[PDB]
């Protein structure tokens, strides 16, 4: 295999994630089988411990591995299936080496950072690079390693010392290093400054890695004088100082790297053996579209953005296929809840007008009681006014709660997550042993609109993250009315898809459809919500 | 509390362990309750994984914590009882923080090196400093922290960043830093060189700690010009550059630090509130004694020295109380074993002449078959020729094997560690649930010489590390002859001391008497071996 | 041209001068035209300001350039003629660039360290490398640059930044770097330590130079484990870690570098196109010779060694051609002076017995009054007792003072350097405009022994450094007796050689014969002193 390391310079927030994803995209565009690793030197073993209010969302892989945002960013740009240990937190390396120590797999010797922690990193990177990450099942040709933190941070030291040794145990024709740096342009004079990137390359070169390529993050483009001054102090030609100026959308970043010849460099620096034309047309569509559509996102985490990162990406990937300029109407369910009337009716009334003015409504997941009755009111409005609706994870469970509350007329109908004491308890904690990762789902009807949206095959494979399901005893009486349990687990144990037959478009799904969305192709539930929202669904079918 | 950090300069092997122990000794000599921490950034959780052939011996604390050599060095110089977590390996800090992460004791936040690993180090140091390490049961006044590795090693970075922050959360009147450096004197010119200690203090000062004291390791003493040149570049007065030249024994190092005023510095730098006169007389005795005694150490690990470090220290502490200049006659049991006659009888014959010329013989512990029949031949010689004998751990088990083999006449008598298939199996694996750490032992007779050596109290408290004991069924017939089981577990379950009544001095003990030896006072079994070896035991009693 | 840089690691005093001279010698031995530069970042323009009591001697080139010791060391090992600006003090570079600034040769721009001082260094090195330093008059193939100070010293920064840029403006096949490091072996454990050379290569690699070769200075040889540990951290193969252990004489150092394949490395690393057999035989002669000869060196600077460095080298180069193991009997002229009898006659009497027991006597140069009458007493003894004598510079002037004082009977005869007030003033300040550098000398007789020693050609070319000469008015009457002015300036203006015809060997020369001495061939005056001292001169002629 060939390996590319991406390292960070002056600060974090220079965009290593979009550069590593773009390097993966331009290499994928050559017909190479690319793979990726995210190294991120925090102590957490996996993302399942993270608070979604604080860190942003938790991504889910086919394994049921709960992982950081940036592996979803790799799956979206590279079009691949990743594995739980292509995320390489430092806490996993220390736990792995400690377990070998306590078992005596090191034979009574003192176990040490540079001979052993630093060697487990090199073994893990070789091991996780060879696995078949592509849907063809082939062993990959090139691995892109992104290293989190910045050079000279003490958290990065085990990994930079591992890659210092790595570039010799794989020969130099098989290992390459990209350095990303800030190039300031202070408003006091408007001159572009190379001084902090000279220090950053002196530090990386002192730790024993030389940049094969230096990538400069700045607002305006680099001039000729700055590319020559960086070439002098960083020991790279003027042609190997790359510029990443600001652009209208992330889809242009692969195109900057192609037009600056970064692909024509790696196909000689690593002696390696189009998709970007679709990517260029997609980038031009995003810029030129003006006709607009607005979707209500009714969610408790809306005090931060990246708590819904894959959902808003899946909507955006659908909106470009719909050829409409999307607006997210963010709504906090705790404002929409009736109780806001007892503190300030203006915040209640605007949460309602933000919903009522939307072309359609979406209910995303997220555990715990806060704002849950506000989601029941959003669903009740969506069913009563017949504006199009989707619910994912909790959005399905809350749809059967609203239908049982208002259509079956059970005034105390609730899930046993929010209150175990009610009569008619319609949803219950039903362990799989949590239902996590890839699982099969079977269609139990031919009549469903969701069946047509998935391309009319008899089964799905989708990614789950839940423990609560609809009660089999109340399920009997719910299907006597307009609510249809369209899709189920492999011998009918658990409800996976629900649809309302009386309504233009109203559905719930137990899984997360957002993780399987891609820039070239949206996942069917979100594309169905937008097709119904612009009213074109009946023409599309 | 007050804290003193000891940090290492140009190389390891400059003697931080003897400097940190000497700083502890001069502070103990002021009437302060001192305590110590050894930080050692290898990944091993505790010493129980170490091979004794490769790392040297495993030390045992009252807890049954298996720990590194340097906590035994602290117990010997400071005269204290340490706890298993006054050894602070980096693998324990990462396992501690990973366990808090996987439990959710960090509330969904990303867990990170500088905010969290670096803070668990500061919490652990405050927590383990306050515990009552003295036999008076009092909370200590000053903690000496020794940091393993050297400044600028990547393994040291979490700990130097922890102490960078620590010196502010405890105020400056409560934290102090000693730096130990090499001062080369190359034979090409014979001038003393300060250049590598100037770089070492620039690096430590860049990581955010300033030396309060610089200690120079060199062969000859420092001159006035070098103390002034170090004072200029290291920002310490000429009076705070300390010299540690070569000396005849470790007992002089506390005396170098007193005569250079290091105690008169800390009692002002830390605003803190004799034993060294006994230490000075002990150091002069070691130098002036010329009458000599030689002891055979019959042991499988003798291809290295520090595999018996506490045993040879306990013999040396006894030899100064005996007023004789000791010789260790090291013997490999695998050379002494009869089988050497089938490869080269010269190596067999010299192993025998090294034994036969000794004034007494000692059998130390260590698991596995290698050379075990050679120890049976050493014990058989010691019983037959009536030269004085001690066995510790295996040395007791092998003494009852030899006595049952040759006196009871059982030609296949063996332990079930070495062969489970024999008739008359005299020793068996008898779990305590391994018998580890401090335990009580009771005397079952008044007639024993070992009872008189321990000062004629009815019980012992001693440190164990074993799983094999004498069979209760064969024990019955062994005491019909000259072999006496002098001492036992608290209701007679297990045999702890054995003595032979027919012999000038021949004993076995199940515990490790060496860990309770001190420079001022040897532990009784080794003092008994030497008193019998010089023939003075009968006069002493 | 090809360039080799020699850089210093952990301390100064590791022997860069003998390594750079040995690299020059093994390359000279291939038939390459080698040249050398000594860079030495002190502020002095040239050596003429130095006190010979404090810095050691001043060397003289053919130009009359007064230069540091280490260009004499290059002339001796490489067998070449150097030029005044192959010594590259930092004060010359700053004065050169300041003069271009004050003339306006930089066109009104701000003149700066990295664009301009750092570029004048690269221009000076290219300019002084191309000049014909060999006696064949050919342009050299390879330049050895030695850089004084150590890496990370602030004085070295302009030069390490110059060579960082230099390795790209000459292509990599034309520039190469040797790093010299200390490898300590502290007596506390006897293990060899690589840690300070790992830091030194991290620092040099951070300043932007990588070692092509690492040379380790240590007492004992390197083991296999240390060559592998240095190969890991320094990015050079185990075969490019070179060992320079201690040896009996400097003549073995070129042989260490050949047998470790350093010549077989540069002839591939630089793609470049025996003498060492004579060098090996010379090194074996120095070790095996046992028959001994002792020479009195009567000199005011004898409180230090390198104040006579070329004189004692010229004696040693003669002693190996004489096949005798030399002893230097150092004598201070101020002890030998009669006045010592008024403070302590023991120091006077031993200075006399040190002279009287010598096989011959030498009087070296050095301005000012101190001890001058003691030299007159040494010369008076040498003439009266007829032990063989040489005087150089002042030793000629003082010989005519002694001859005029005692043979012409002028009781106040003196030079006007020491007293201008006397009658019969025999030596006077006679400016050439000081007489410095290479000049011609003509023989004025066929009868001289010095003429036979120089190979009986009618003229000499020799190196001068003086301003006082014999008075032409007293010269008339001196040659009426046994004192003969053998050699003179090109039309008889100044006296250059004197000889006494009544004596076994007694001569004065105005020039410094020591600077033209070489290991393979001594200069004639010193070889004449030793041939007369062992009595073999009459057989040799
Ligand atoms: N292919 C990508 C890469 C990044 N992003 C988004 O861009 C933001 C962060 O960009 P990133 O490249 O990861 O830079 P930072 O996170 O700011 O900084 P870092 O280099 O440390 O990752 C996040 O919302 C991330 O989800 C994205 O939408 N698509
Ligand atoms: N001397 C330091 C300082 C910080 N960190 C690491 O820095 C990481 C966070 O990176 P970054 O956000 O770039 O550091 P900040 O201090 O937050 O820098 P900034 O203010 O620019 O955000 C943390 O996980 C922490 O372990 C480190 O290893 N060594
Ligand atoms: N109070 C002490 C301290 C040290 N030693 C012994 O001295 C040797 C090592 O000395 P030490 O001070 O620990 O220096 P090093 O181990 O060589 O190096 P370091 O500073 O890293 O510990 C070991 O045999 C150790 O047991 C001893 O007998 N008594
Ligand atoms: N931070 C420093 C310290 C010293 N020097 C230089 O060091 C040179 C002398 O080198 P060296 O003898 O090796 O330095 P010392 O301080 O004398 O080191 P040592 O004690 O080993 O002799 C001086 O000319 C001085 O300019 C420097 O440039 N920068
Ligand atoms: N070819 C050589 C080289 C050195 N020396 C002598 O060796 C001593 C110093 O050796 P050197 O190699 O120059 O090392 P140092 O001066 O000690 O240190 P440095 O590397 O800084 O020059 C001086 O007396 C010098 O004249 C010599 O006789 N012949
Ligand atoms: N860049 C490095 C190099 C080494 N180490 C640490 O160095 C420790 C051993 O210290 P030391 O013996 O002093 O290092 P050596 O390489 O063995 O140095 P030396 O050759 O002098 O023995 C190891 O545990 C290793 O983790 C480190 O952290 N960072
Ligand atoms: Mg990122
Ligand atoms: Mg500028
Ligand atoms: Mg130690
Ligand atoms: Mg110096
Ligand atoms: Mg030199
Ligand atoms: Mg080591």
Residue numbers in the entry:
A (entry chain C), B (entry chain A), C (entry chain B): 1 to 273, 280 to 439, 448 to 555
Paper text:
Using 312,573 particles for reconstruction, we achieved a final resolution of 3.3 Å. The tetramers are connected through α-helix-mediated interactions involving residues 346–357 in the GAT domain. Notably, residues H355 and W358, which are critical for filament assembly across species, exhibited continuous electron density in the density map, underscoring their conserved role. We designated these as the canonical and non-canonical binding pockets, respectively. In the canonical binding pocket, the triphosphate group of CTP is stabilized by electrostatic and hydrogen-bonding interactions with each protomer.
CTP synthase (CTPS) is a key enzyme in de novo CTP synthesis, playing a critical role in nucleotide metabolism and cellular proliferation.
